[PDB]
């Protein structure tokens, strides 16, 4: 038996059995976080409009 | 009368040597990485007792989004503005000592006064650059630099005031 975070696909069904899916998810994209940016000169006018 | 000359010279050597010493050390005194001091070029610890080139404007952990690290950090690097104050002050004392003789009633004193006060502006602006980029206590010769800028400003006041005094003599005797 395979009790593990295994992704279920057609070809994987084509060879073995899977129970009903218990936890749903999607493909995820991960990056490095940048530091909290400081505005600078823009703070002179930044708010209230463009 | 000659009080203008006195205050002028004592302002020259005063703010000049004071700016130099400001370039020397005692610009920022605080815990290092452990406590040390630094003068925008190299920090010196209390290992302890030695020094190290500390003005490493780049550091190998950042993101550098867009002209923020490069332009600003580089501007604070090499201490351009305070060096501009150095050169401009040099022109200050040099051009005033030039104004000693070779009369040229009007142009010189006004000129050196202008470049001298504006030199002060370069000094303050540079200080702004420094305190800005540094983002705990300050160095004492830092206060020597600011005070140098101030005494410089007053010296410029006496300068231009003496210039318009000369104008008062000329236009006065003109009639």
Short mmCIF file of N, CA and C in Angstrom, two decimals, chain B:
data_model
loop_
_atom_site.label_atom_id
_atom_site.label_comp_id
_atom_site.label_asym_id
_atom_site.label_seq_id
_atom_site.Cartn_x
_atom_site.Cartn_y
_atom_site.Cartn_z
N UNK B 1 35.09 97.20 11.46
CA UNK B 1 36.13 97.31 10.45
C UNK B 1 36.88 96.00 10.29
N UNK B 2 38.11 95.97 10.80
CA UNK B 2 38.92 94.77 10.73
C UNK B 2 38.30 93.56 11.40
N UNK B 3 37.29 93.78 12.25
CA UNK B 3 36.55 92.68 12.84
C UNK B 3 36.04 91.74 11.76
N UNK B 4 35.68 92.29 10.60
CA UNK B 4 35.28 91.45 9.48
C UNK B 4 36.42 90.53 9.06
N UNK B 5 37.64 91.06 9.01
CA UNK B 5 38.78 90.23 8.65
C UNK B 5 39.01 89.15 9.70
N UNK B 6 38.93 89.53 10.98
CA UNK B 6 39.18 88.58 12.06
C UNK B 6 38.17 87.44 12.00
N UNK B 7 36.88 87.76 12.15
CA UNK B 7 35.85 86.74 12.08
C UNK B 7 35.94 85.94 10.79
N UNK B 8 36.36 86.59 9.70
CA UNK B 8 36.50 85.89 8.43
C UNK B 8 37.55 84.80 8.52
N UNK B 9 38.76 85.15 8.96
CA UNK B 9 39.84 84.18 9.01
C UNK B 9 39.54 83.08 10.03
N UNK B 10 39.10 83.46 11.23
CA UNK B 10 38.83 82.46 12.25
C UNK B 10 37.72 81.53 11.80
N UNK B 11 36.79 82.04 10.99
CA UNK B 11 35.83 81.16 10.36
C UNK B 11 36.49 80.23 9.36
N UNK B 12 37.44 80.76 8.58
CA UNK B 12 38.10 79.95 7.57
C UNK B 12 38.83 78.77 8.20
N UNK B 13 39.82 79.05 9.04
CA UNK B 13 40.55 77.96 9.69
C UNK B 13 39.63 77.15 10.59
N UNK B 14 38.67 77.80 11.24
CA UNK B 14 37.80 77.10 12.17
C UNK B 14 36.99 76.02 11.46
N UNK B 15 36.13 76.43 10.53
CA UNK B 15 35.28 75.47 9.84
C UNK B 15 36.09 74.57 8.92
N UNK B 16 37.23 75.05 8.43
CA UNK B 16 38.05 74.25 7.53
C UNK B 16 38.69 73.08 8.28
N UNK B 17 39.50 73.40 9.29
CA UNK B 17 40.10 72.35 10.10
C UNK B 17 39.03 71.49 10.76
N UNK B 18 37.91 72.11 11.14
CA UNK B 18 36.83 71.35 11.77
C UNK B 18 36.23 70.35 10.79
N UNK B 19 36.11 70.74 9.52
CA UNK B 19 35.62 69.82 8.51
C UNK B 19 36.63 68.70 8.26
N UNK B 20 37.92 69.04 8.25
CA UNK B 20 38.95 68.01 8.09
C UNK B 20 38.87 66.99 9.21
N UNK B 21 38.91 67.46 10.46
CA UNK B 21 38.78 66.58 11.61
C UNK B 21 37.50 65.76 11.50
N UNK B 22 36.42 66.39 11.03
CA UNK B 22 35.19 65.65 10.79
C UNK B 22 35.41 64.52 9.80
N UNK B 23 36.28 64.74 8.81
CA UNK B 23 36.64 63.67 7.90
C UNK B 23 37.49 62.63 8.61
N UNK B 24 38.16 63.00 9.71
CA UNK B 24 39.06 62.06 10.35
C UNK B 24 38.39 60.87 11.01
N UNK B 25 37.73 61.07 12.14
CA UNK B 25 37.08 59.99 12.88
C UNK B 25 35.88 60.57 13.63
N UNK B 26 35.37 59.82 14.60
CA UNK B 26 34.30 60.25 15.50
C UNK B 26 33.09 60.77 14.73
N UNK B 27 32.63 59.94 13.79
CA UNK B 27 31.41 60.23 13.05
C UNK B 27 30.23 59.36 13.46
N UNK B 28 30.48 58.19 14.04
CA UNK B 28 29.39 57.34 14.52
C UNK B 28 29.96 56.35 15.53
N UNK B 29 29.49 56.44 16.77
CA UNK B 29 29.99 55.62 17.87
C UNK B 29 28.84 54.78 18.41
N UNK B 30 28.95 53.46 18.28
CA UNK B 30 27.85 52.58 18.65
C UNK B 30 28.32 51.13 18.56
N UNK B 31 27.42 50.22 18.91
CA UNK B 31 27.74 48.80 18.91
C UNK B 31 27.98 48.31 17.49
N UNK B 32 29.12 47.65 17.28
CA UNK B 32 29.51 47.16 15.97
C UNK B 32 29.19 45.67 15.84
N UNK B 33 29.60 45.10 14.71
CA UNK B 33 29.39 43.69 14.45
C UNK B 33 30.41 43.12 13.48
N UNK B 34 29.88 43.97 21.17
CA UNK B 34 30.79 44.45 20.14
C UNK B 34 30.45 45.89 19.79
N UNK B 35 31.31 46.82 20.21
CA UNK B 35 31.10 48.24 19.98
C UNK B 35 32.35 48.84 19.34
N UNK B 36 32.13 49.90 18.56
CA UNK B 36 33.22 50.55 17.83
C UNK B 36 32.75 51.93 17.38
N UNK B 37 33.60 52.58 16.59
CA UNK B 37 33.30 53.86 15.97
C UNK B 37 33.68 53.78 14.50
N UNK B 38 33.18 54.73 13.72
CA UNK B 38 33.48 54.78 12.29
C UNK B 38 33.31 56.21 11.79
N UNK B 39 34.07 56.54 10.75
CA UNK B 39 34.03 57.85 10.16
C UNK B 39 33.70 57.81 8.68
N UNK B 40 32.80 56.91 8.30
CA UNK B 40 32.27 56.73 6.95
C UNK B 40 33.29 56.09 6.01
N UNK B 41 34.51 55.83 6.45
CA UNK B 41 35.48 55.11 5.64
C UNK B 41 35.85 53.76 6.24
N UNK B 42 36.31 53.73 7.49
CA UNK B 42 36.73 52.49 8.11
C UNK B 42 36.44 52.56 9.60
N UNK B 43 35.89 51.48 10.14
CA UNK B 43 35.54 51.40 11.55
C UNK B 43 36.71 50.83 12.34
N UNK B 44 36.78 51.19 13.62
CA UNK B 44 37.86 50.76 14.50
C UNK B 44 37.27 50.27 15.81
N UNK B 45 37.58 49.02 16.16
CA UNK B 45 37.01 48.38 17.34
C UNK B 45 37.67 48.92 18.60
N UNK B 46 37.37 48.30 19.74
CA UNK B 46 37.90 48.76 21.02
C UNK B 46 39.20 48.05 21.38
N UNK B 47 41.84 41.67 16.89
CA UNK B 47 40.43 41.97 17.10
C UNK B 47 40.25 43.38 17.67
N UNK B 48 39.98 43.45 18.97
CA UNK B 48 39.77 44.74 19.62
C UNK B 48 41.05 45.57 19.58
N UNK B 49 40.92 46.82 19.14
CA UNK B 49 42.05 47.71 19.00
C UNK B 49 42.52 47.90 17.58
N UNK B 50 42.02 47.10 16.64
CA UNK B 50 42.39 47.19 15.24
C UNK B 50 41.31 47.95 14.47
N UNK B 51 41.47 48.00 13.15
CA UNK B 51 40.53 48.69 12.28
C UNK B 51 40.25 47.83 11.06
N UNK B 52 39.22 48.20 10.31
CA UNK B 52 38.86 47.46 9.11
C UNK B 52 38.13 48.39 8.16
N UNK B 53 38.40 48.21 6.86
CA UNK B 53 37.73 49.02 5.84
C UNK B 53 36.23 48.78 5.92
N UNK B 54 35.49 49.77 6.40
CA UNK B 54 34.09 49.58 6.73
C UNK B 54 33.15 50.21 5.71
N UNK B 55 33.64 51.08 4.83
CA UNK B 55 32.75 51.73 3.88
C UNK B 55 32.45 50.80 2.71
N UNK B 56 32.05 49.57 3.01
CA UNK B 56 31.67 48.60 1.98
C UNK B 56 30.22 48.86 1.61
N UNK B 57 30.02 49.90 0.81
CA UNK B 57 28.67 50.28 0.39
C UNK B 57 27.86 49.10 -0.15
N UNK B 58 28.42 48.20 -0.96
CA UNK B 58 27.70 46.96 -1.24
C UNK B 58 27.92 45.93 -0.15
N UNK B 59 26.87 45.16 0.11
CA UNK B 59 26.92 44.02 1.02
C UNK B 59 26.21 42.85 0.35
N UNK B 60 26.77 41.66 0.49
CA UNK B 60 26.34 40.54 -0.34
C UNK B 60 25.10 39.84 0.22
N UNK B 61 24.06 40.62 0.55
CA UNK B 61 22.75 40.05 0.85
C UNK B 61 21.73 41.19 0.69
N UNK B 62 21.04 41.22 -0.44
CA UNK B 62 20.11 42.31 -0.73
C UNK B 62 19.26 41.92 -1.92
N UNK B 63 18.48 42.87 -2.42
CA UNK B 63 17.70 42.74 -3.65
C UNK B 63 18.00 43.83 -4.66
N UNK B 64 18.18 45.08 -4.22
CA UNK B 64 18.54 46.20 -5.08
C UNK B 64 17.51 46.39 -6.20
N UNK B 65 16.33 46.86 -5.79
CA UNK B 65 15.17 46.91 -6.67
C UNK B 65 15.40 47.76 -7.92
N UNK B 66 15.50 49.08 -7.77
CA UNK B 66 15.60 49.95 -8.95
C UNK B 66 16.20 51.29 -8.51
N UNK B 67 17.48 51.48 -8.82
CA UNK B 67 18.18 52.75 -8.63
C UNK B 67 18.14 53.24 -7.18
N UNK B 68 17.72 52.39 -6.25
CA UNK B 68 17.69 52.74 -4.84
C UNK B 68 19.02 52.41 -4.17
N UNK B 69 19.42 51.14 -4.21
CA UNK B 69 20.71 50.75 -3.67
C UNK B 69 21.84 51.41 -4.45
N UNK B 70 21.82 51.26 -5.78
CA UNK B 70 22.91 51.76 -6.62
C UNK B 70 23.10 53.26 -6.45
N UNK B 71 22.08 54.04 -6.82
CA UNK B 71 22.26 55.48 -6.91
C UNK B 71 22.46 56.10 -5.53
N UNK B 72 21.55 55.81 -4.60
CA UNK B 72 21.64 56.43 -3.28
C UNK B 72 22.85 55.91 -2.51
N UNK B 73 22.97 54.59 -2.40
CA UNK B 73 24.09 54.01 -1.67
C UNK B 73 25.42 54.48 -2.25
N UNK B 74 25.51 54.54 -3.58
CA UNK B 74 26.73 55.03 -4.21
C UNK B 74 26.96 56.50 -3.89
N UNK B 75 25.89 57.29 -3.86
CA UNK B 75 26.02 58.70 -3.52
C UNK B 75 26.62 58.85 -2.14
N UNK B 76 26.07 58.14 -1.15
CA UNK B 76 26.64 58.19 0.18
C UNK B 76 28.06 57.64 0.20
N UNK B 77 28.36 56.71 -0.70
CA UNK B 77 29.71 56.17 -0.78
C UNK B 77 30.68 57.24 -1.27
N UNK B 78 31.94 57.08 -0.87
CA UNK B 78 33.04 57.97 -1.26
C UNK B 78 32.84 59.39 -0.74
N UNK B 79 31.75 59.63 -0.01
CA UNK B 79 31.51 60.88 0.70
C UNK B 79 31.70 62.09 -0.21
N UNK B 80 30.97 62.09 -1.32
CA UNK B 80 31.18 63.10 -2.35
C UNK B 80 30.81 64.48 -1.82
N UNK B 81 29.57 64.64 -1.35
CA UNK B 81 29.12 65.95 -0.88
C UNK B 81 30.02 66.57 0.18
N UNK B 82 30.40 65.88 1.26
CA UNK B 82 31.31 66.53 2.22
C UNK B 82 32.65 66.87 1.62
N UNK B 83 33.16 66.05 0.69
CA UNK B 83 34.37 66.43 -0.03
C UNK B 83 34.13 67.67 -0.87
N UNK B 84 32.94 67.78 -1.46
CA UNK B 84 32.58 69.01 -2.15
C UNK B 84 32.66 70.20 -1.20
N UNK B 85 32.19 70.02 0.03
CA UNK B 85 32.35 71.06 1.03
C UNK B 85 33.82 71.35 1.28
N UNK B 86 34.66 70.32 1.25
CA UNK B 86 36.10 70.51 1.45
C UNK B 86 36.66 71.42 0.36
N UNK B 87 36.45 71.05 -0.90
CA UNK B 87 36.98 71.83 -2.01
C UNK B 87 36.44 73.25 -1.97
N UNK B 88 35.14 73.39 -1.74
CA UNK B 88 34.52 74.70 -1.77
C UNK B 88 35.05 75.59 -0.65
N UNK B 89 35.24 75.02 0.54
CA UNK B 89 35.86 75.79 1.62
C UNK B 89 37.28 76.19 1.26
N UNK B 90 38.04 75.27 0.68
CA UNK B 90 39.38 75.59 0.20
C UNK B 90 39.34 76.81 -0.70
N UNK B 91 38.39 76.84 -1.63
CA UNK B 91 38.18 78.03 -2.44
C UNK B 91 37.76 79.22 -1.58
N UNK B 92 37.12 78.96 -0.45
CA UNK B 92 36.70 80.03 0.43
C UNK B 92 37.89 80.77 1.00
N UNK B 93 38.68 80.07 1.82
CA UNK B 93 39.85 80.70 2.41
C UNK B 93 40.83 81.19 1.36
N UNK B 94 41.02 80.40 0.30
CA UNK B 94 41.96 80.80 -0.75
C UNK B 94 41.52 82.10 -1.42
N UNK B 95 40.23 82.21 -1.75
CA UNK B 95 39.74 83.39 -2.44
C UNK B 95 39.59 84.59 -1.51
N UNK B 96 39.44 84.38 -0.21
CA UNK B 96 39.42 85.50 0.72
C UNK B 96 40.82 86.05 0.92
N UNK B 97 41.77 85.16 1.24
CA UNK B 97 43.17 85.55 1.26
C UNK B 97 43.57 86.20 -0.06
N UNK B 98 42.93 85.80 -1.16
CA UNK B 98 43.11 86.52 -2.41
C UNK B 98 42.48 87.90 -2.34
N UNK B 99 41.34 88.02 -1.67
CA UNK B 99 40.68 89.31 -1.53
C UNK B 99 41.44 90.27 -0.63
N UNK B 100 42.45 89.79 0.09
CA UNK B 100 43.30 90.67 0.88
C UNK B 100 43.82 91.84 0.05
N UNK B 101 44.60 91.54 -0.99
CA UNK B 101 45.16 92.52 -1.90
C UNK B 101 44.47 92.41 -3.25
N UNK B 102 44.98 93.15 -4.24
CA UNK B 102 44.43 93.12 -5.60
C UNK B 102 42.95 93.51 -5.57
N UNK B 103 42.74 94.79 -5.23
CA UNK B 103 41.50 95.29 -4.64
C UNK B 103 40.23 94.72 -5.27
N UNK B 104 39.97 95.02 -6.54
CA UNK B 104 38.79 94.53 -7.25
C UNK B 104 37.54 94.65 -6.38
N UNK B 105 37.20 95.92 -6.10
CA UNK B 105 36.28 96.29 -5.03
C UNK B 105 35.08 95.36 -4.88
N UNK B 106 34.46 94.95 -5.98
CA UNK B 106 33.14 94.34 -5.93
C UNK B 106 33.10 92.84 -6.14
N UNK B 107 33.81 92.30 -7.12
CA UNK B 107 33.50 90.96 -7.60
C UNK B 107 33.94 89.88 -6.61
N UNK B 108 35.14 90.02 -6.05
CA UNK B 108 35.78 88.89 -5.38
C UNK B 108 35.06 88.54 -4.09
N UNK B 109 34.92 89.51 -3.18
CA UNK B 109 34.34 89.22 -1.87
C UNK B 109 32.96 88.61 -2.02
N UNK B 110 32.14 89.18 -2.91
CA UNK B 110 30.83 88.61 -3.19
C UNK B 110 30.95 87.18 -3.70
N UNK B 111 31.86 86.94 -4.64
CA UNK B 111 32.01 85.61 -5.21
C UNK B 111 32.34 84.58 -4.14
N UNK B 112 33.46 84.78 -3.44
CA UNK B 112 33.87 83.84 -2.40
C UNK B 112 32.80 83.69 -1.33
N UNK B 113 32.09 84.78 -1.02
CA UNK B 113 30.97 84.66 -0.10
C UNK B 113 29.91 83.70 -0.60
N UNK B 114 29.54 83.83 -1.88
CA UNK B 114 28.52 82.96 -2.46
C UNK B 114 28.97 81.51 -2.40
N UNK B 115 30.11 81.21 -3.02
CA UNK B 115 30.60 79.84 -3.05
C UNK B 115 30.85 79.31 -1.65
N UNK B 116 31.02 80.20 -0.68
CA UNK B 116 31.28 79.82 0.70
C UNK B 116 29.99 79.41 1.42
N UNK B 117 28.95 80.23 1.31
CA UNK B 117 27.67 79.87 1.91
C UNK B 117 27.11 78.63 1.23
N UNK B 118 27.06 78.65 -0.10
CA UNK B 118 26.64 77.46 -0.83
C UNK B 118 27.48 76.26 -0.45
N UNK B 119 28.77 76.48 -0.16
CA UNK B 119 29.59 75.41 0.39
C UNK B 119 28.97 74.87 1.67
N UNK B 120 28.57 75.76 2.57
CA UNK B 120 27.84 75.31 3.74
C UNK B 120 26.64 74.46 3.38
N UNK B 121 25.89 74.88 2.37
CA UNK B 121 24.76 74.08 1.91
C UNK B 121 25.20 72.69 1.50
N UNK B 122 26.32 72.59 0.78
CA UNK B 122 26.87 71.29 0.44
C UNK B 122 27.16 70.47 1.69
N UNK B 123 27.67 71.13 2.73
CA UNK B 123 27.97 70.42 3.97
C UNK B 123 26.71 69.82 4.59
N UNK B 124 25.69 70.66 4.79
CA UNK B 124 24.47 70.18 5.43
C UNK B 124 23.82 69.09 4.59
N UNK B 125 23.70 69.33 3.28
CA UNK B 125 23.13 68.32 2.39
C UNK B 125 23.88 67.00 2.52
N UNK B 126 25.21 67.07 2.58
CA UNK B 126 25.99 65.85 2.76
C UNK B 126 25.65 65.15 4.06
N UNK B 127 25.56 65.91 5.16
CA UNK B 127 25.15 65.32 6.43
C UNK B 127 23.82 64.60 6.27
N UNK B 128 22.89 65.22 5.55
CA UNK B 128 21.61 64.58 5.26
C UNK B 128 21.83 63.25 4.56
N UNK B 129 22.73 63.24 3.57
CA UNK B 129 23.03 61.99 2.87
C UNK B 129 23.50 60.94 3.85
N UNK B 130 24.40 61.31 4.76
CA UNK B 130 24.97 60.34 5.68
C UNK B 130 23.90 59.77 6.62
N UNK B 131 23.23 60.64 7.38
CA UNK B 131 22.22 60.15 8.31
C UNK B 131 21.18 59.33 7.57
N UNK B 132 20.88 59.72 6.33
CA UNK B 132 19.91 58.98 5.53
C UNK B 132 20.39 57.56 5.29
N UNK B 133 21.52 57.41 4.61
CA UNK B 133 21.95 56.09 4.15
C UNK B 133 22.21 55.12 5.30
N UNK B 134 22.45 55.63 6.51
CA UNK B 134 22.81 54.76 7.62
C UNK B 134 21.69 53.84 8.05
N UNK B 135 20.49 53.99 7.48
CA UNK B 135 19.38 53.11 7.81
C UNK B 135 19.21 52.03 6.75
N UNK B 136 23.10 52.83 20.02
CA UNK B 136 23.09 53.74 18.88
C UNK B 136 23.38 55.17 19.29
N UNK B 137 24.47 55.73 18.78
CA UNK B 137 24.85 57.10 19.10
C UNK B 137 25.77 57.63 18.01
N UNK B 138 25.94 58.94 17.99
CA UNK B 138 26.75 59.62 16.99
C UNK B 138 28.17 59.85 17.48
N UNK B 139 29.05 60.14 16.54
CA UNK B 139 30.40 60.54 16.88
C UNK B 139 30.48 62.02 17.21
N UNK B 140 31.49 62.37 18.00
CA UNK B 140 31.62 63.76 18.45
C UNK B 140 32.09 64.66 17.32
N UNK B 141 33.09 64.21 16.56
CA UNK B 141 33.56 65.01 15.43
C UNK B 141 32.49 65.18 14.37
N UNK B 142 31.45 64.35 14.39
CA UNK B 142 30.25 64.64 13.61
C UNK B 142 29.65 65.98 14.01
N UNK B 143 29.35 66.14 15.31
CA UNK B 143 28.94 67.44 15.81
C UNK B 143 29.95 68.51 15.45
N UNK B 144 31.24 68.16 15.41
CA UNK B 144 32.23 69.12 14.95
C UNK B 144 31.99 69.50 13.49
N UNK B 145 31.49 68.57 12.68
CA UNK B 145 31.22 68.89 11.29
C UNK B 145 30.02 69.80 11.14
N UNK B 146 28.93 69.48 11.84
CA UNK B 146 27.76 70.35 11.80
C UNK B 146 28.09 71.74 12.31
N UNK B 147 28.74 71.81 13.48
CA UNK B 147 29.13 73.10 14.03
C UNK B 147 30.04 73.85 13.07
N UNK B 148 30.92 73.13 12.38
CA UNK B 148 31.73 73.75 11.34
C UNK B 148 30.86 74.39 10.27
N UNK B 149 29.83 73.66 9.81
CA UNK B 149 28.92 74.23 8.83
C UNK B 149 28.26 75.50 9.36
N UNK B 150 27.87 75.49 10.63
CA UNK B 150 27.18 76.65 11.20
C UNK B 150 28.10 77.86 11.24
N UNK B 151 29.25 77.72 11.92
CA UNK B 151 30.21 78.82 11.99
C UNK B 151 30.56 79.31 10.60
N UNK B 152 30.65 78.38 9.64
CA UNK B 152 30.82 78.77 8.25
C UNK B 152 29.69 79.69 7.81
N UNK B 153 28.45 79.31 8.12
CA UNK B 153 27.32 80.12 7.69
C UNK B 153 27.42 81.53 8.24
N UNK B 154 27.70 81.66 9.54
CA UNK B 154 27.87 82.99 10.12
C UNK B 154 28.99 83.75 9.43
N UNK B 155 30.10 83.07 9.14
CA UNK B 155 31.21 83.72 8.45
C UNK B 155 30.76 84.26 7.11
N UNK B 156 29.90 83.51 6.41
CA UNK B 156 29.36 84.01 5.16
C UNK B 156 28.47 85.22 5.37
N UNK B 157 27.70 85.23 6.46
CA UNK B 157 26.88 86.39 6.78
C UNK B 157 27.75 87.63 6.92
N UNK B 158 28.79 87.54 7.75
CA UNK B 158 29.71 88.66 7.88
C UNK B 158 30.36 89.01 6.55
N UNK B 159 30.58 88.00 5.70
CA UNK B 159 31.20 88.25 4.40
C UNK B 159 30.31 89.14 3.54
N UNK B 160 29.12 88.65 3.19
CA UNK B 160 28.24 89.42 2.32
C UNK B 160 27.92 90.76 2.95
N UNK B 161 27.80 90.79 4.28
CA UNK B 161 27.53 92.04 4.97
C UNK B 161 28.67 93.03 4.72
N UNK B 162 29.91 92.55 4.78
CA UNK B 162 31.05 93.40 4.45
C UNK B 162 31.02 93.82 2.99
N UNK B 163 30.56 92.93 2.10
CA UNK B 163 30.51 93.27 0.69
C UNK B 163 29.57 94.44 0.45
N UNK B 164 28.33 94.33 0.94
CA UNK B 164 27.40 95.44 0.80
C UNK B 164 27.88 96.66 1.56
N UNK B 165 28.74 96.47 2.57
CA UNK B 165 29.40 97.62 3.18
C UNK B 165 30.29 98.33 2.17
N UNK B 166 31.10 97.56 1.43
CA UNK B 166 31.92 98.16 0.39
C UNK B 166 31.06 98.87 -0.65
N UNK B 167 29.95 98.25 -1.04
CA UNK B 167 29.00 98.93 -1.92
C UNK B 167 28.55 100.25 -1.32
N UNK B 168 28.29 100.26 -0.01
CA UNK B 168 27.86 101.49 0.65
C UNK B 168 28.95 102.55 0.57
N UNK B 169 30.21 102.14 0.67
CA UNK B 169 31.30 103.11 0.54
C UNK B 169 31.37 103.66 -0.88
N UNK B 170 31.28 102.78 -1.88
CA UNK B 170 31.41 103.22 -3.27
C UNK B 170 30.25 104.12 -3.68
N UNK B 171 29.03 103.59 -3.63
CA UNK B 171 27.86 104.40 -3.98
C UNK B 171 27.74 105.61 -3.07
N UNK B 172 28.22 105.51 -1.83
CA UNK B 172 28.21 106.65 -0.94
C UNK B 172 29.09 107.77 -1.47
N UNK B 173 30.37 107.48 -1.69
CA UNK B 173 31.28 108.49 -2.24
C UNK B 173 30.97 108.83 -3.69
N UNK B 174 30.01 108.14 -4.31
CA UNK B 174 29.73 108.38 -5.73
C UNK B 174 29.17 109.77 -5.96
N UNK B 175 28.33 110.25 -5.06
CA UNK B 175 27.72 111.57 -5.20
C UNK B 175 28.77 112.68 -5.10
#
